[PDB]
Amino acid sequence: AMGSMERASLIQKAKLAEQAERYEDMAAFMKGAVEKGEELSCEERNLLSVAYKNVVGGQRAAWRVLSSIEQKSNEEGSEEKGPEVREYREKVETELQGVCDTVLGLLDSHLIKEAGDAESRVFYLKMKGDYYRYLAEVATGDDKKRIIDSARSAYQEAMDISKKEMPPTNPIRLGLALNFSVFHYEIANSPEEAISLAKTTFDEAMADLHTLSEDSYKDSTLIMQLLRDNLTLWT
Amino acid sequence: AMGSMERASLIQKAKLAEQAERYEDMAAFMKGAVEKGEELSCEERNLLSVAYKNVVGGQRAAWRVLSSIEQKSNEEGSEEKGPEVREYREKVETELQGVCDTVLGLLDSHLIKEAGDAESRVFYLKMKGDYYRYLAEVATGDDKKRIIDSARSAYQEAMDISKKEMPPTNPIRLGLALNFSVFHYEIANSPEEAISLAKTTFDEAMADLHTLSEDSYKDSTLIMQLLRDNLTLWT
Amino acid sequence: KRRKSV
Amino acid sequence: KRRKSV
Numbered sequence: 001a002m003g004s005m006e007r008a009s010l011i012q013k014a015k016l017a018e019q020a021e022r023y024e025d026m027a028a029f030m031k032g033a034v035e036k037g038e039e040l041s042c043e044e045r046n047l048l049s050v051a052y053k054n055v056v057g058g059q060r061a062a063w064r065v066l067s068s069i070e071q072k073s074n075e076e077g078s079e080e081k082g083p084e085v086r087e088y089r090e091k092v093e094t095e096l097q098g099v100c101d102t103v104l105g106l107l108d109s110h111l112i113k114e115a116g117d118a119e120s121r122v123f124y125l126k127m128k129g130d131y132y133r134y135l136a137e138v139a140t141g142d143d144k145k146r147i148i149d150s151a152r153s154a155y156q157e158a159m160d161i162s163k164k165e166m167p168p169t170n171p172i173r174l175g176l177a178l179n180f181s182v183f184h185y186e187i188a189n190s191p192e193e194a195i196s197l198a199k200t201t202f203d204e205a206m207a208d209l210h211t212l213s214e215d216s217y218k219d220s221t222l223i224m225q226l227l228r229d230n231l232t233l234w235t
Numbered sequence: 236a237m238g239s240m241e242r243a244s245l246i247q248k249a250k251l252a253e254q255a256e257r258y259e260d261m262a263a264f265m266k267g268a269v270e271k272g273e274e275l276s277c278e279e280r281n282l283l284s285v286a287y288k289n290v291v292g293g294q295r296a297a298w299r300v301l302s303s304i305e306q307k308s309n310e311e312g313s314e315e316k317g318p319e320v321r322e323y324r325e326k327v328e329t330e331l332q333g334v335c336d337t338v339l340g341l342l343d344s345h346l347i348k349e350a351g352d353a354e355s356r357v358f359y360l361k362m363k364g365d366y367y368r369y370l371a372e373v374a375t376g377d378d379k380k381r382i383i384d385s386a387r388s389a390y391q392e393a394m395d396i397s398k399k400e401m402p403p404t405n406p407i408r409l410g411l412a413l414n415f416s417v418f419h420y421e422i423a424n425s426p427e428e429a430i431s432l433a434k435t436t437f438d439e440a441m442a443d444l445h446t447l448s449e450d451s452y453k454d455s456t457l458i459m460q461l462l463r464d465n466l467t468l469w470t
Numbered sequence: 471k472r473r474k475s476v
Numbered sequence: 477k478r479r480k481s482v
């Protein structure tokens with residue numbers, strides 16, 4: 001749908017969509033930019049991830065509402081409404097899945113293959129881990145296990161690279177750790193691992209802060225605070 | 236698209252969509268319920284208006300962002316970006332217009348024709364005035380005048396009925412007055428009329444509050460406060 | 471403060 | 477308080 005628009009026009013429109021909180025549009029513009037076949041810049045990767053994060057974020061929030069209703073209507077002494085709650089939860093779930101598959105597909109051809117620099121490769125592998133994780137949040141079937149492992153292996157590979165190649169205060173490194181810790185906590189049923197990861201990550205970033213310019217690491221600061229919020233919630 | 240679903244299932248799903256903040260879905264379910272050809276109940280009219288109010292509300296908010304950017308890029312010493320801002324503002328505008336036309340169309344066949352009770356007829360005429368008003372917010376062409384007059388005539392007819400048939404604290408009567416006052420202020424370039432309407436409306440509702448049960452008029456209270464907010468902003 | 475409607 | 481991700 002975006003094949004007739006210049007790459008630069010798609011990037012510009014993704015930035016306008018962001019300002020207008022039109023995240024579906026933003027995601028469609030960024031998909032079209034990716035499909036031009038050139039690697040994305042640091043700024044363009046951020047637009048890509050923000051667009052899809054917001055689209056799936058709204059779907060996942062809806063899915064959680066509908067799932068909670070559905071689960072309530074399946075309890076002790078709740079009364080039979082009929083199939084509507086389940087159908088509508090399935091409709092939202094299916095659309096969410098289709099957006100995850102779209103992102104995963106863009107990642108696998110060809111953001112991940114062509115990413116040589118550490119900051120881009122870790123960024124894309126983090127996205128791959130995130131979107132498999134959102135698949136795992138709704139998976140109840142045969143392949144829940146395989147989906148969970150796909151998220152784990154993406155996050156693990158990102159983690160391996162980020163440790164070798166990036167400082168501990170790098171905001172991509174920090175975000176990856178934050179999300180991988182969430183994965184361990186609520187997807188992999190490994191809250192000790194989640195806690196240990198969040199703590200180690202936070203502590204190592206604190207100790208490396210002396211190397212940093214400020215206010216040039218406001219992203220790193222915010223993410224350190226989310227790690228702290230999780231540690232507070234979980235301990 | 237909704238012709239195969241039972242009316243009651245569409246109403247139920249519109250309520251789930253509301254809880255999930257899935258307003259596009261909500262609007263589509265309510266459109267499908269209207270198309271069953273039975274009159275809507277008081278509760279169902281509210282679902283209808285809330286669904287579309289939220290969909291168009293997000294579009295109008297986006298349109299305002301993009302318009303402000305566009306107008307900035309057309310000023311003294313702003314530099315030529317190219318056609319992207321205008322194209323993307325036009326795309327948002329076109330979709331907004333299409334949603335207004337969809338609502339107006341549902342109103343004209345056949346919510347308005349079949350509404351005999353005062354509360355339903357005023358409610359639908361208020362919607363007709365609102366959606367013509369949102370058309371007028373973006374109209375810059377030949378028919379801006381005709382669109383503005385269509386909003387005025389709908390609001391005027393609603394106002395005439397609501398005065399004859401409803402008490403001054405009726406929340407539909409109050410909301411209609413609130414919106415008609417906004418129309419006068421920023422669409423019809425008649426701020427004196429907007430102010431006089433908001434004041435009279437508020438004062439008459441205050442004087443009729445003694446007749447009311449509470450907490451049975453929380454909607455009327457909130458709308459009286461919006462009238463007060465406008466009067467504060469405008470005077 | 472943007473004006474209110476309902 | 478729902479746990480944070482980024």
Ligand SMILES: C=CC(C)(C)OC[C@H]1O[C@H](O[C@@H]2C3=C([C@H](C)COC(C)=O)C[C@H](O)[C@]3(C)/C=C3/[C@@H](COC)CC[C@H]3[C@@H](C)[C@H]2O)[C@H](O)[C@@H](OC(C)=O)[C@@H]1O
Pocket residue numbers: 018046047049050053123124126127171172174175176217218219220222223482
């Ligand atoms: C403001 C919107 C746009 C233009 C899209 O930028 C989003 C943000 O983009 C950058 O921030 C990134 C970033 C975010 C920061 C944590 C936001 O920081 C602040 C202070 O707002 C959240 C965004 O979603 C984004 C792009 C995402 C990620 C996440 C991506 O996973 C695949 C990993 C961690 C984080 C990294 C890439 C952050 O560097 C910038 O460093 C931020 O600006 C500052 C001053 O920190 C800007 O707000």
Ligand SMILES: C=CC(C)(C)OC[C@H]1O[C@H](O[C@@H]2C3=C([C@H](C)COC(C)=O)C[C@H](O)[C@]3(C)/C=C3/[C@@H](COC)CC[C@H]3[C@@H](C)[C@H]2O)[C@H](O)[C@@H](OC(C)=O)[C@@H]1O
Pocket residue numbers: 253281282284285288358359361362406407409410411452453454455457458476
């Ligand atoms: C909560 C969501 C649903 C179920 C959709 O209901 C929306 C709301 O629906 C009713 O409120 C209506 C109503 C609104 C109230 C002002 C909300 O009141 C409170 C305290 O939240 C705003 C809604 O958009 C709605 C449906 C719209 C209108 C507007 C319609 O124009 C065509 C005219 C004024 C207003 C009227 C119809 C209000 O009566 C009810 O009276 C409200 O509940 C209470 C306690 O007042 C409920 O919040």
Ligand SMILES: [Ca+2]
Pocket residue numbers: 231232233234235
């Ligand atoms: Ca605690």
Ligand SMILES: [Ca+2]
Pocket residue numbers: 466467468469470
């Ligand atoms: Ca004032």
Ligand SMILES: [Cl-]
Pocket residue numbers: 087088091248
């Ligand atoms: Cl459905």
Ligand SMILES: [Cl-]
Pocket residue numbers: 013322323326
């Ligand atoms: Cl466009």
Ligand SMILES: [Mg+2]
Pocket residue numbers: 006007
């Ligand atoms: Mg080209």
Ligand SMILES: [Mg+2]
Pocket residue numbers: 081082083084244247
């Ligand atoms: Mg049922």
Ligand SMILES: [Mg+2]
Pocket residue numbers: 090093094
């Ligand atoms: Mg399913």
Ligand SMILES: [Mg+2]
Pocket residue numbers: 192
């Ligand atoms: Mg322990």
Ligand SMILES: [Mg+2]
Pocket residue numbers: 241242
């Ligand atoms: Mg039937």
Ligand SMILES: [Mg+2]
Pocket residue numbers: 009012316317318319
């Ligand atoms: Mg340009």
Ligand SMILES: [Mg+2]
Pocket residue numbers: 325328329
């Ligand atoms: Mg136009």
Ligand SMILES: [Mg+2]
Pocket residue numbers: 427
């Ligand atoms: Mg005067």
